[PDB]
Amino acid sequence: DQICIGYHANNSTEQVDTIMEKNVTVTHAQDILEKKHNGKLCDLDGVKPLILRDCSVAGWLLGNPMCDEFINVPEWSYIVEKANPVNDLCYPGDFNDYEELKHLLSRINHFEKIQIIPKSSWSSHEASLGVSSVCPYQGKSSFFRNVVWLFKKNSTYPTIKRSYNNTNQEDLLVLWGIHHPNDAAEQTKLYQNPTTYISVGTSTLNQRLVPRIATRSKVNGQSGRMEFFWTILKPNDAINFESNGNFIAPEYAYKIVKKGDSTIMKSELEYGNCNTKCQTPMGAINSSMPFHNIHPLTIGECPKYVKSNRLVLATGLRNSP
Amino acid sequence: DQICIGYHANNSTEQVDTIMEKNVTVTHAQDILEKKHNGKLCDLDGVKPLILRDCSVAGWLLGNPMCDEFINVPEWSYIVEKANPVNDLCYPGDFNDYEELKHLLSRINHFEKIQIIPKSSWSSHEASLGVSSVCPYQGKSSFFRNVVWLFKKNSTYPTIKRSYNNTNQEDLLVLWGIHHPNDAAEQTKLYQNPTTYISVGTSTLNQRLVPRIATRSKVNGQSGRMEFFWTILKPNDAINFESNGNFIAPEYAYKIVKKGDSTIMKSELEYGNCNTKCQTPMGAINSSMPFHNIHPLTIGECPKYVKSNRLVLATGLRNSP
Amino acid sequence: DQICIGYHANNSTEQVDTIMEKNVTVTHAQDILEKKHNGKLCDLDGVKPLILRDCSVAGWLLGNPMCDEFINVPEWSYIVEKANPVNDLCYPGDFNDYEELKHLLSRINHFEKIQIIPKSSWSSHEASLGVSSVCPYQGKSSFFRNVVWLFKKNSTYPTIKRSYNNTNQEDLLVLWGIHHPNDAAEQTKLYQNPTTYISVGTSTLNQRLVPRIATRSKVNGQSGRMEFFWTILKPNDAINFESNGNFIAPEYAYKIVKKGDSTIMKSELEYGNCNTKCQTPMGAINSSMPFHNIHPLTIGECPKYVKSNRLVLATGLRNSP
Amino acid sequence: GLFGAIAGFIEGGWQGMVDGWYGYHHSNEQGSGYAADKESTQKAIDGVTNKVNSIIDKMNTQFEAVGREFNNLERRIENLNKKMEDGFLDVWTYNAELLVLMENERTLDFHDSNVKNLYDKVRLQLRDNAKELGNGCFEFYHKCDNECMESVRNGTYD
Amino acid sequence: GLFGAIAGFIEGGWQGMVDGWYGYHHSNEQGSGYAADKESTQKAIDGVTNKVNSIIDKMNTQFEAVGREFNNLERRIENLNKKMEDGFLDVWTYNAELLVLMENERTLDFHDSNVKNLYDKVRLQLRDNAKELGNGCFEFYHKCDNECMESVRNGTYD
Amino acid sequence: GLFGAIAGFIEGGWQGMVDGWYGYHHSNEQGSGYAADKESTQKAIDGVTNKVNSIIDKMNTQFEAVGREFNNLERRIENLNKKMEDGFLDVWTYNAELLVLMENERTLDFHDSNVKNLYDKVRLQLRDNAKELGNGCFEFYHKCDNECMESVRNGTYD
Ligand SMILES: *[C@@H]1O[C@H](CO)[C@@H](O)[C@H](O)[C@H]1NC(C)=O
Ligand SMILES: *[C@@H]1O[C@H](CO)[C@@H](O)[C@H](O)[C@H]1NC(C)=O
Ligand SMILES: *[C@@H]1O[C@H](CO)[C@@H](O)[C@H](O)[C@H]1NC(C)=O
């Protein structure tokens, strides 16, 4: 008559690592690392992302004629932009403090576009002629839709004194521009006046832009450059414009109605007609695991990213062969 | 006859956590996290902090007329500033590289103010008239105390060629300014000359400031703006000023006699008439614990900050019920 | 008759630390921290570093006449520069975005210097007279070797319109400069024209430099200042220069043929005629240990830096006395 | 195994004991079989479950990467930003991998300990009345019948 | 307990032993009482004291937050600075909390081990001459008198 | 020692056993000497070797400092860069030093455990046939001769 003490064995083939021993076979284990994603871009918690496609953030905000898909966009969860969007800055130039603006966009979920200065309001200057073959729309020469490229009228460009006050209760993103011609004759042709300036002011901003006339490489068939600036106009503050030429003027601005939780992710993927609670630039995660190894940049209710290929905890004991 | 092996139990109710078990009652434990502070701002190792109160660093350095409390301050341990000081920049404007200056202040414990250019030394320009209703002192119009707002004399503003050499053995903080008027008539009224500049130079600095005339929102009843600049004048170097208008000139500068260990903390608290060896923006710590959870920013002989609510080590054994 | 169980003791004096006990003597241990270096600067994997000696990066790129040792340098593994090189910027001034350039150098192993604009090509301006007593070479007045200090010819300085296109398949580093005189008479003497500019443009750059005339401290006997700029000219892009004075023009530029793994280390040490697989600014490491405590900044196949004085693992058991 | 029971003096586990982690095999004239020790098994289930939860939650406050962009002349701070984000990810990967390694070793030892203590509980009761075979088993001196077998597992014997 | 003594085969501790952490209860015709084992108690005091000190000092080189300010157009580096300061604080909080958790488990086990080794020291001497009850106690076969009791604690018996 | 064998009930090690980490001393009419237990010694060599390798490689993905320069008006980001590089170095120094401390404690315990299990293997076989002296030794009741001594080490006795 015998009584024996013993322990459970099973048909398990699950393995765990320890400091002293690798690949120990255990009766039970719990994998805690999520390795699968769905490879799509999805709605986040019901809310569709803003998928720019071929447009850049600059191309979207300024109103590149090829970016009409985004004339008025709904509330978004996150924004997706390609590494190298073709539709950006159709008339070549620079976008001043662009990355600081992009940063500010990561804390915004909704814009509402409002007209601050009507195209039909310019009396001493021409407003329908500021178009370019660099910015085509349907085969014809066009231009950024949210700003106005103003020219001289009847051989004169009187000094512009303009003013907007933010009636709205929301912060307002205001964009404007300056044209840097390639020669003195172009300056004459376009604006009449040889030496120009643009002065912009709010309660915080103290700005004067002077055009730079220089000869440069043709980008999209243009030797001119456009340089774009922005500011956030607080509530009940006013923005004062004064210019005598080279002025790319605001027609539209954006009211900010911002959820405040968002990101611009870089991805070549298109919309995947799916819903998820956790999105990466490579695909969405639906997991109950505490960790994942898909990609560092996620948004939503997400597992902790680690760089491991494998994370498995022992729960049971050393399985016997 | 029996002999037994056993272990100590007591009336202890102290609890410790382990990975496998929470709230294990132990006979003895050592709490290692300090959770208490005194809620006051105190002297550090005998040495009173500089409590700016309603003044900002800019308001203090420039000599805002409402900041007379700080005309000459003793050696300090740390500096305390409110989130939104009312007394800053009374005549509206900007303070160039302000945050870099604030950073440099964190490595300074004492300033000595010296006159570099006497108010009584301006011969071809008026010096007693540069005052403003924006900067009141005792109901009357006044101005920043360390700089001089110079006007034309007898309908003339001759070119200023000035020079200071640092005799002192200490680095010298020198502040100056420029006035940006709101219109051409104000430029005429104040300085006579229509187009102006200020050139500043040392062995390292190569500067020329051009005033920006623009129409802007009234801040404190002013549409003009002041823009302030600073530099550190090394020993035996000289600072050359040349201007024909819009010049806010240095009357005083600060000799640096710097302990080098300090910080600017943000707090709404007032002076607490206490002494301590460890100060946080919320209150002082007097503890023998290695860790604390009061606030990340401390100065002095201080425990290590952790974000824990509880850190208790077992010393004794599992107490029996 | 007895049988006993026991364990190994030896004459070992090696000690290990544990949480509960320090200096436990063990029969065997493995030291895992490398504490020795050779104190020299060595070739890395056969490849000699660029040891600037008394020259700075700026002094080397611009062609300071005292830096002829580096007129044409071979491929390098790393670069070594002194804390305070004497031979830098012989004619005093600033080097625009110098640290961003230095950063870009850390990802470069080879330059090839090519002539972009010949000294013998200036027709309406003098090219052999731009020399200075600040930049001596062999007792005589000289100047930066890679750029050309152009003066007026026969009392005239016609507008310069120049252009270079990058035929090469490699990115090209292009340097140019501007002279800031100390007075109007010097401006007259040197360039004839009272008000000047330099405009530089590629497909990305939109630049106009205006000289700043001001009185300043003599550095190396000069009150003038030189200000140097750079850009990377992409393949098949062109660089357009337009100036009417104060122009320090490129004679030479550098083709980039970049390994991409390198660093600028700061050291006072000279070349040590040695070879190594791991280099620090204090000396080279030849070790099989996983950790070292020599210096944070290393290059090559290197152990992990830790700030420990001692890292010793127990392998054997507690040695008996 | 630090405690010498699992794959030590008890050579291997039992496919026939599906009932729990640790238990008994008895053999006598009436027959033979397995019975799990529910108490130590449950003590083991709780310990391991809390461990997992503890592991999961201590790692719940971790570094989150935040998309951040820089222009062509901000290479230094871009690189700063790259080396910072990677630094923390490396720190946390290491923490995760090490905790798992260390705690896997502790879990295997924990089971080994539970088996040894269960062995000792049975040994301390049987005393003289059984030959300890040295394989996890006790051969009885006197006949033991199913109720006698309950008695040992019960903790009340003699 | 990994070692099976504390709240294992010895069901609970002694309120009556105020003298030290581990010791003995004796009972005979002359009476009964407690005596602490000063040597293993002191070995335990030293181990635990060094541990605390080790814990305290390994954490003495930690991250210190440094006030740092940024203007309205330096949001990216401000945020960089925020995520960096928080990153380290999280790393060190985790380190602190985990060390304490792991080392608390080791301290409880350490005590358990000291009790078991003390039990074994007494068992190895008594041998045949005492019935091992299975509760921490040894019932003597032969009468043992206070000097006989010293003898066991003394380590010199028979 | 948590397991009570090394510098516990076995007072000290053997200078005379050069052959391996753990083994036996025998003494009889034919003579006396040492014999290492190659199996548990090798099990110990493998465990310790893997440990070192594990320690080495978990630390192979560490923070590398990268030279980075700043002008006179970039003090804030320079300081940021300084406090970041130092932060990680401190984190990794701490990780390195702590792992070594914790794993040194585990290695000493591991050896202690191997000695105790080897002791128990011999005890479980000798049974009644030997007086357990309480010092690591078993005095035989009956004469044991060199082949009888092989038998114990062999694991096949009686
Ligand atoms: C902006 O317009 C509002 C609406 O009248 C006004 O109350 C506010 O004072 C204005 N702010 C200015 C003029 O700066
Ligand atoms: C500054 O003044 C001192 C005092 O004479 C003089 O030695 C030094 O050379 C001066 N530095 C200049 C003129 O830059
Ligand atoms: C640069 O020169 C090459 C060589 O002819 C030419 O193909 C290219 O178009 C030029 N780029 C310009 C003119 O910007």
Numbering used by the authors:
A (entry chain E), B (entry chain E), C (entry chain E): 5 to 325
D (entry chain F), E (entry chain F), F (entry chain F): 1 to 158
Q: What are the paper's exact sentences on this?
A:
Thus to better understand the nature and significance of such adaptive changes, it is essential to monitor HA changes that may affect receptor specificity of avian influenza viruses, particularly during human infection. A single amino acid difference was observed in the HA of each egg-grown virus: Asp186Glu in A/Vietnam/CL1/2004, Val134Ala in A/Vietnam/CL105/2005, and Phe151Leu in A/Vietnam/CL2009C/2005 (H5 numbering). The effects of the single amino acid substitutions in the HA on receptor binding were also studied by X-ray crystallography of HAs in complex with pentasaccharides possessing terminal sialic acid (Sia) linked to galactose (Gal) by either α2-3 (LSTa) or α2-6 (LSTc) linkage.
Sialic acid was not detected in crystals of the Ile151Phe mutant HA soaked in either LSTa or LSTc receptor analogs. Soaking crystals of the Ile151Phe HA, prepared by vaccinia virus expression, with either the α2-3- or α2-6-sialyl pentasaccharide failed to yield any evidence of ligand binding. Comparison of the wild type and mutant HAs indicates that the side-chain of Phe151 projects into the receptor binding site about 2 Å further than Ile151. The structure of the mutant HA shows that the larger Phe side chain projects further into the binding site such that it may restrict binding. It would appear that this mutation is only advantageous in the presence of compensatory mutations in HA or other genes. The 151Phe variant comprised 65% of the virus population on day 7, increasing to 100% in the clinical specimen from which the MDCK cell isolate was derived on day 8.
